[PDB]
Write a protein that binds this ligand. Structure first.
Ligand SMILES: COC(=O)[C@H](Cc1ccccc1)NC(=O)[C@@H](N)CC(=O)O
Lengths: 255, 227
């Protein structure tokens, strides 16, 4: 009977090195809005580093693996890390806590997704069938009204807030950090190509093994049906120079 | 004076009630904040009351050694906590089935944390032996929830004075606070402090926990919860 985290340790003793005889340290944030890619990348990453992907049945499971779940219990990733630390979060780049990793942060992976999809996939978080249209409308109505899911100057923020925080992060909040940005739809289109780019970009050490990545991969909408006014109101969001719209058009989710 | 004030207790062991009567007097929850990535100020002009159930020695609270003015720890007979927690887990205590499961996991873990809350003794030690390293500016007051219920007036008095929130404290002003904090709550088992009603073995095992070598027993006996 072994501990459920044994795969996170080599368990080799005494420990040896490939770098010495006789990749850059820092935090790697895997960041996205809910249902916008960072759980999948966070699972794939485990598979690559560890050999074994975590067991994620639902959103509660997925939330276990975030900075936020870690915070609810008073823990924190290291701020003076001696190695690569990968931490998933959906939090906005400018919430106070992440103030502590200014110097610490090495890499930012930000993933965005079509908010149509985020919106629907989210409706499964709140435990809504496709048949309680009533509940759906209320959720979508509250989503469209908020331009996102942060309804209960911090937390997730609106979609455009979240996006602007991480994508603009390198300039001030994370000076030593490089930032890569990837649309979920692209990942889903070419997952092996794309995840190999992510692993290069995250600089965990050594040559990316494209076979190591293929195995690590294998492990892994209109709103009319809710009502005219839903689809309609969401479409106002995509019109503008104002923010939701700017981002929706830059990421190819408006037309 | 100015600095952080922790209102700390195990779940359902006091701090909410007290955070209510301070609220009522005047007119922050650490874990809730933290879940949004928010932190109480580490450089404060004002006094800052913050309620937490976490054990004092969690990393996050390490950001606060200098910032911390006072600690109020609240403590409560575990039996009663064990039973209020049951209701928090949204289980009727007509339903012995789930109730048993729950009590059994409580006793197995010497508390409600199955980092974090900690066991019950880990939590008590954490805040009662903590000025020692974690919060060396702070003055620390422990208090049994029982006695608070016993003399809300004379005990809450002790509190408001101790935290030093607002100049001088009037008994009039105080009276209105324990009024609402209970009048509000009031709108919202065996009588011998026994768990036998959930079956003998359960009582048997809590009893063993209370009268062994384990620390739970230690802190129990020193506060008047070992009978
Ligand atoms: C954060 O990641 C997600 O929300 C997961 C990640 C994922 C994608 C594809 C295959 C497995 C897992 N995806 C979704 O929410 C789903 N909505 C994907 C879909 O509907 O096609």
């Amino acid at each position: 009977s072994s501990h459920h985290h044994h795969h996170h340790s080599s368990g080799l003793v005494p420990r040896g090195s490939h770098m010495a005889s006789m990749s850059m340290n820092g935090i790697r944030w895997i960041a996205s809005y809910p249902k916008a890619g960072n759980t999948w990348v966070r699972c794939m990453l485990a598979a690559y580093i560890t050999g074994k992907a975590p067991q994620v049945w639902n959103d509660i499971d997925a939330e276990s693996l975030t900075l936020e779940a870690m915070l609810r219990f008073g823990d924190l990733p290291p701020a003076e890390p001696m190695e690569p630390v990968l931490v998933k979060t959906h939090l906005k780049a400018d919430v106070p806590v992440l103030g502590l990793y200014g110097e610490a942060t090495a890499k930012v992976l930000y993933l965005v997704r079509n908010p149509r999809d985020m919106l629907l996939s989210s409706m499964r978080m709140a435990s809504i069938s496709r048949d309680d249209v009533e509940k759906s409308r209320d959720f979508a109505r509250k989503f469209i009204a908020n331009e996102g899911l942060g309804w209960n100057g911090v937390g997730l923020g609106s979609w455009p807030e979240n996006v602007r925080s991480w994508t603009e992060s390198s300039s001030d909040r994370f000076p030593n950090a490089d930032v890569l940005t990837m649309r979920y739809e692209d990942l889903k289109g070419d997952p092996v190509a794309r995840f190999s780019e992510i692993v290069e970009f995250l600089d965990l050490g050594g040559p990316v093994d494209i076979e190591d990545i293929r195995r690590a991969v294998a492990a892994s909408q209109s709103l009319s049906f809710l009502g005219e006014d839903i689809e309609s109101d969401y479409q106002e969001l995509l019109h503008g120079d104002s923010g939701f719209a700017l981002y929706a058009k830059q990421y190819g989710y408006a037309g």
